[PDB]
Scaffold this active site. Structure first.
Site, PDB file in Angstrom:
ATOM      1  N   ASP A  28       0.791  -1.240   0.000  1.00 48.84           N
ATOM      2  CA  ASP A  28       0.000   0.000   0.000  1.00 48.84           C
ATOM      3  C   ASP A  28       0.817   1.282   0.000  1.00 48.84           C
ATOM      4  O   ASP A  28       0.229   2.356  -0.228  1.00 48.84           O
ATOM      5  CB  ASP A  28      -1.090   0.043   1.099  1.00 48.84           C
ATOM      6  CG  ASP A  28      -0.526   0.066   2.525  1.00 48.84           C
ATOM      7  OD1 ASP A  28       0.648   0.450   2.744  1.00 48.84           O
ATOM      8  OD2 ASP A  28      -1.325  -0.280   3.430  1.00 48.84           O
ATOM      9  N   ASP A 138      -0.040  -9.924   8.158  1.00 45.90           N
ATOM     10  CA  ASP A 138      -0.028  -9.436   6.774  1.00 45.90           C
ATOM     11  C   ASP A 138       1.417  -9.039   6.461  1.00 45.90           C
ATOM     12  O   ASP A 138       2.017  -8.237   7.188  1.00 45.90           O
ATOM     13  CB  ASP A 138      -0.966  -8.234   6.685  1.00 45.90           C
ATOM     14  CG  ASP A 138      -1.577  -8.019   5.345  1.00 45.90           C
ATOM     15  OD1 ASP A 138      -1.345  -8.826   4.432  1.00 45.90           O
ATOM     16  OD2 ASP A 138      -2.312  -6.989   5.229  1.00 45.90           O
TER      17      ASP A 138
HETATM   18  O1  LIG Z   1       0.637   5.704   7.297  1.00 44.47           O
HETATM   19  C1  LIG Z   1       0.496   6.534   8.475  1.00 44.47           C
HETATM   20  C2  LIG Z   1      -0.834   6.190   9.138  1.00 44.47           C
HETATM   21  O2  LIG Z   1      -0.859   4.770   9.333  1.00 44.47           O
HETATM   22  C3  LIG Z   1      -2.131   4.355   9.853  1.00 44.47           C
HETATM   23  O3  LIG Z   1      -2.175   2.930   9.896  1.00 44.47           O
HETATM   24  C4  LIG Z   1      -2.734   2.283   8.737  1.00 44.47           C
HETATM   25  C5  LIG Z   1      -1.634   2.011   7.699  1.00 44.47           C
HETATM   26  O4  LIG Z   1      -1.215   3.238   7.035  1.00 44.47           O
HETATM   27  C6  LIG Z   1      -2.088   1.031   6.624  1.00 44.47           C
HETATM   28  O5  LIG Z   1      -0.919   0.637   5.877  1.00 44.47           O
HETATM   29  C7  LIG Z   1      -2.733  -0.172   7.326  1.00 44.47           C
HETATM   30  O6  LIG Z   1      -3.216  -1.117   6.360  1.00 44.47           O
HETATM   31  O7  LIG Z   1      -3.816   0.276   8.164  1.00 44.47           O
HETATM   32  C8  LIG Z   1      -3.302   0.980   9.282  1.00 44.47           C
HETATM   33  C9  LIG Z   1      -4.439   1.250  10.275  1.00 44.47           C
HETATM   34  O8  LIG Z   1      -5.527   1.932   9.622  1.00 44.47           O
HETATM   35  C10 LIG Z   1      -2.248   4.902  11.261  1.00 44.47           C
HETATM   36  O9  LIG Z   1      -3.481   4.473  11.836  1.00 44.47           O
HETATM   37  C11 LIG Z   1      -2.233   6.419  11.199  1.00 44.47           C
HETATM   38  O10 LIG Z   1      -2.243   6.964  12.530  1.00 44.47           O
HETATM   39  C12 LIG Z   1      -0.971   6.871  10.499  1.00 44.47           C
HETATM   40  O11 LIG Z   1      -1.042   8.292  10.288  1.00 44.47           O
HETATM   41  O1  LIG Z   2      -7.107  -8.601   4.473  1.00 43.03           O
HETATM   42  C1  LIG Z   2      -5.759  -9.085   4.626  1.00 43.03           C
HETATM   43  C2  LIG Z   2      -4.960  -8.743   3.365  1.00 43.03           C
HETATM   44  O2  LIG Z   2      -5.533  -9.527   2.305  1.00 43.03           O
HETATM   45  C3  LIG Z   2      -4.730  -9.495   1.119  1.00 43.03           C
HETATM   46  O3  LIG Z   2      -5.433 -10.230   0.104  1.00 43.03           O
HETATM   47  C4  LIG Z   2      -5.333 -11.660   0.206  1.00 43.03           C
HETATM   48  C5  LIG Z   2      -6.756 -12.229   0.052  1.00 43.03           C
HETATM   49  O4  LIG Z   2      -7.601 -11.936   1.170  1.00 43.03           O
HETATM   50  C6  LIG Z   2      -6.742 -13.745  -0.165  1.00 43.03           C
HETATM   51  O5  LIG Z   2      -8.043 -14.260  -0.555  1.00 43.03           O
HETATM   52  C7  LIG Z   2      -5.854 -14.047  -1.343  1.00 43.03           C
HETATM   53  O6  LIG Z   2      -5.689 -15.453  -1.519  1.00 43.03           O
HETATM   54  O7  LIG Z   2      -4.572 -13.590  -0.983  1.00 43.03           O
HETATM   55  C8  LIG Z   2      -4.467 -12.176  -0.954  1.00 43.03           C
HETATM   56  C9  LIG Z   2      -2.988 -11.884  -0.825  1.00 43.03           C
HETATM   57  O8  LIG Z   2      -2.467 -12.256   0.457  1.00 43.03           O
HETATM   58  C10 LIG Z   2      -4.571  -8.091   0.584  1.00 43.03           C
HETATM   59  O9  LIG Z   2      -3.609  -8.106  -0.489  1.00 43.03           O
HETATM   60  C11 LIG Z   2      -4.101  -7.155   1.669  1.00 43.03           C
HETATM   61  O10 LIG Z   2      -4.165  -5.826   1.135  1.00 43.03           O
HETATM   62  C12 LIG Z   2      -4.991  -7.286   2.906  1.00 43.03           C
HETATM   63  O11 LIG Z   2      -4.469  -6.462   3.957  1.00 43.03           O
END
Ligand SMILES: OC[C@H]1O[C@@H](O[C@H]2[C@H](O)[C@@H](O)[C@H](O)O[C@@H]2CO)[C@H](O)[C@@H](O)[C@@H]1O
Ligand SMILES: OC[C@H]1O[C@@H](O[C@H]2[C@H](O)[C@@H](O)[C@H](O)O[C@@H]2CO)[C@H](O)[C@@H](O)[C@@H]1O
Length: 179
Positions: A28, A138
Site C-alpha cells: 500500500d 499481513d
Molecule cells: O501511514 C500513516 C498512518 O498509518 C495508519 O495505519 C494504517 C496504515 O497506514 C495502513 O498501511 C494499514 O493497512 O492500516 C493501518 C491502520 O488503519 C495509522 O493508523 C495512522 O495513525 C498513520 O497516520
Molecule cells: O485482508 C488481509 C490482506 O488480504 C490481502 O489479500 C489476500 C486475500 O484476502 C486472499 O483471498 C488471497 O488469496 O490472498 C491475498 C494476498 O495475500 C490483501 O492483499 C491485503 O491488502 C490485505 O491487507
C-alpha cells in the site's frame, strides 16, 4: 485437509502444541502505524518497504487495545515457520519450511479486513479469525520480498523472538520508538 493446524477444544488452531497463524501479503506504500518514516508525512523509510516487516491483526498489534498508532507491539519481532498448510483456494504449499523473522511496523485493522484480521481478542483469549487462527500476519510485499520466499499465504506457527540487530537499528528511527 489443506490446513494442517488442528483446532483445539477451544477452536484455536495449533500444530504440535504451538499456536498457528494465517498470513497474507499486502502492498500500500503508507508509512504505517508504527511511524517508520519521516514525521508528519505519509512516506515510509525505504527499509520499511524492502525488509521482512509485517502488519499483524489489530488486537495483537495493540496487545488487546484498539490504538492504530504506536500500538503496544510496534517493534516486536516474530518468527514464522511454515507448516506446509494453507487455506484452500487462498494459498498454497511452500517449497520449504525455513523460518523467517519479521518485525511489526504496521497494523491490519479489523475494519476492512474482517476475514483475516477480524479477531476480537488478543492471543491467549481463544478468539480466532474466520479460518481458526488466533492471530494473522499481513506481510509487506512492496518489493516482492514475499514472492522471493515463494510464500503464497502459508499457514505458519508463530512466536515472539528478539529482533535481529539490523531490524533493531532500523526501528530506532521510527516515531513510535520509546513511546
Ligand atoms: O501511514 C500513516 C498512518 O498509518 C495508519 O495505519 C494504517 C496504515 O497506514 C495502513 O498501511 C494499514 O493497512 O492500516 C493501518 C491502520 O488503519 C495509522 O493508523 C495512522 O495513525 C498513520 O497516520
Ligand atoms: O485482508 C488481509 C490482506 O488480504 C490481502 O489479500 C489476500 C486475500 O484476502 C486472499 O483471498 C488471497 O488469496 O490472498 C491475498 C494476498 O495475500 C490483501 O492483499 C491485503 O491488502 C490485505 O491487507
Amino acid at each position: 485437509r489443506a490446513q494442517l493446524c488442528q483446532p483445539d477444544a477451544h477452536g484455536v488452531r495449533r500444530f504440535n502444541g504451538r499456536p498457528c497463524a494465517s498470513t497474507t501479503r499486502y502492498v500500500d506504500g503508507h508509512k504505517g502505524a508504527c511511524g517508520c518514516g519521516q514525521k508528519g508525512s505519509d512516506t515510509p523509510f525505504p527499509w520499511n518497504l524492502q525488509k521482512h516487516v509485517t502488519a499483524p491483526s489489530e488486537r495483537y498489534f495493540d496487545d488487546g487495545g484498539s490504538n492504530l498508532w504506536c500500538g503496544k507491539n510496534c517493534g516486536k519481532c516474530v518468527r514464522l515457520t511454515p507448516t506446509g498448510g494453507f487455506v484452500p483456494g487462498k494459498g498454497g504449499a511452500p517449497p520449504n519450511h525455513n523460518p523467517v523473522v519479521f518485525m511489526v511496523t504496521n497494523a491490519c485493522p479489523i475494519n476492512g479486513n474482517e476475514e483475516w484480521c477480524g479477531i476480537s481478542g488478543k492471543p491467549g483469549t481463544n478468539h480466532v479469525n474466520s479460518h481458526g487462527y488466533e492471530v494473522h500476519f499481513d506481510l509487506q510485499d512492496q518489493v516482492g520480498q514475499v514472492e522471493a520466499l515463494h510464500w503464497d499465504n502459508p499457514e505458519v506457527t508463530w512466536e515472539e523472538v528478539p529482533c535481529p540487530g539490523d531490524l533493531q537499528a532500523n526501528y530506532q528511527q521510527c516515531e513510535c520508538h520509546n513511546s
